[PDB]
Amino acid sequence: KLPPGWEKAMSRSSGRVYYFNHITNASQWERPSGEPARVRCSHLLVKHSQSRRPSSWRQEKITRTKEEALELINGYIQKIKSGEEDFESLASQFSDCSSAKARGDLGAFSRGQMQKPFEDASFALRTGEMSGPVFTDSGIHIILRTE
Ligand SMILES: Cn1ccccc1=O
Ligand SMILES: Cn1ccccc1=O
């Protein structure tokens, strides 16, 4: 029926159907369109107190809760989708990863290099698409597939 990971869902507020991807946590009104050795992604990471290393270039000691981190991720997604903010600008300013200095770019990678939820979401994204919140031991990620 639909591409890998996608399923139909029902909007509680509006009653209109939408599409949700359980690998990438992406959700959208439009029916999704239509695997490579390598993909290229950028990401925006929000760390929290249970992160594998609760530190970043932004904060020596990261104290926010997982729930607080998810709220921040949700808000960044809203601003990217409305177009008030660009993914790359938010990543440079707010990502808790060293890759913030490269507008979130991680370069290209193969399967078996990244943490598995990040890998699976990256390879289920189509070129140019963006994930919802993706959870790993580092924190909570927004992922943008660029190649
Ligand atoms: C095809 N399509 C169109 C608009 C937003 C998302 C998407 O996947
Ligand atoms: C997202 N990411 C970045 C570096 C190493 C592993 C990983 O999952």
- Which domain CATH number covers 26? 2.20.70.10
Same domain, residue pair 15 and 80: no
Same domain, residue pair 73 and 133: yes
Q: Atom 7 in ligand 2: which residue has the minimum CA distance?
A: 114
Query: 68 by DSSP, 3-state: which?
Result: helix
Determined by: X-ray
Question: What is the side-by-side strand order in the sheet with 134-135?
Answer: 105-109, 39-46, 140-145, 134-135
Q: Is 115 in the pocket of ligand 1 (CB under 6 A)?
A: no
Query: 105 by DSSP, 3-state: which?
Result: strand
DSSP tag of 123: H
Q: Give ∠ CA 131-39-103 in degrees, rounded to 5.
A: 65
Task: Tell me, in angstroms, the distance from the centre of ligand 2 to residue 113's CA.
Answer: 8
Same domain, residue pair 49 and 87: yes
Q: How many domains does the chain have?
A: 2
Same domain, residue pair 20 and 50: no
Same domain, residue pair 23 and 66: no
Query: 122 by DSSP, 3-state: which?
Result: helix
Q: Give ∠ CA 104-122-10 in degrees, rounded to 5.
A: 110
Same domain, residue pair 57 and 128: yes
Residue 141 designated active-site: yes
Domain that holds residue 75: 38-147
Q: Which atom of ligand 2 is nearest to the CA of 43?
A: 1
| Residues in the chain, total | 147
H or E stretch including 54?
Answer: none
d(CA 72, CA 67) in angstroms, rounded, equals 9
Catalytic residue among 97, 99, 122, 131: 97
Resolution in A: 1.8
